[PDB]
Amino acid sequence: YSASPALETKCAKARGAYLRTHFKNSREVAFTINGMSLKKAFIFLDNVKEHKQAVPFRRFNGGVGRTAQGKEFGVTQARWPVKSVKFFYDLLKNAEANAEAKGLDMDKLIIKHVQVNAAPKQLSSPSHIEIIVAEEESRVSLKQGAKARNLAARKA
Template sequence: MARIKYSYQPADETKAVKAMGYEMPISFKHAVEICRFIKGRKIAEAKKLLEEVIALKRPIPFKRYKKKVAHKSGLEKWYAGRYPQKACRYILKILKNLEANAEYKGLDVDKLVIVHAQAKMGRKIKKYVPRAFGRATPWFQQLTTVEFVAEEVE
């Protein structure tokens, strides 16, 4: 299998750290909204926010995929939001991996800021749902790849 390339290359590789979750069984739309929500934040703050979403204490604002999304209280300057718990659990694992990579590189975890957070569509796995009278309906499982790059900020 070929190595997957990151879409973002940091200017100084020695002060940056990367982590990727490859082809995870989560919603692409949820992953996009979560990435937008945590980009520009410190790693500890992002982890705390995702844990609050998993505990249903804070909603994620849905700014792009907002059609037929209910209004949620607790959002700042926005109306539509959800609690994508499954996607948050997977993305939280990637953030823990990002933190471990930073410690391995000898970087100060408290100074790291997420400068790149992106969700990409992965493969589609074709499955079938059995129906009445011997028929079947195709059903596609969408896999999602999420990548993060954090850099030290003085």
């Protein structure tokens, strides 16, 4: 994968390729849900699916409508792409299952790494998606040294 983590010590992995979702919306959802606790991310995705929270649009923010639900992230522009969230929800189900398989502690899991890459254009622009969940945790010169020696004797 992309990052030096995914060591089997305290990690679990999941990925998706050629997922039929827009690249830019998937990127914005990935950026937002990065670093959150795993169970915390789930309800947040449930909130976005049910319009009780919105994912900020930061890089691909062209023409987004301003909403009051983008206030928690400090931005003025927010949107609720539900297709990409459903793709992310399924991916997190699989990553959660892989965590079960390896045998971690699921209560303290965090989204350590998530990255969306462009896929062979087929037109739509598919997106490769990958998720990592894991756990948290001179010298002394002759004159300088001689002065150090004299001051050492001075204190005593």
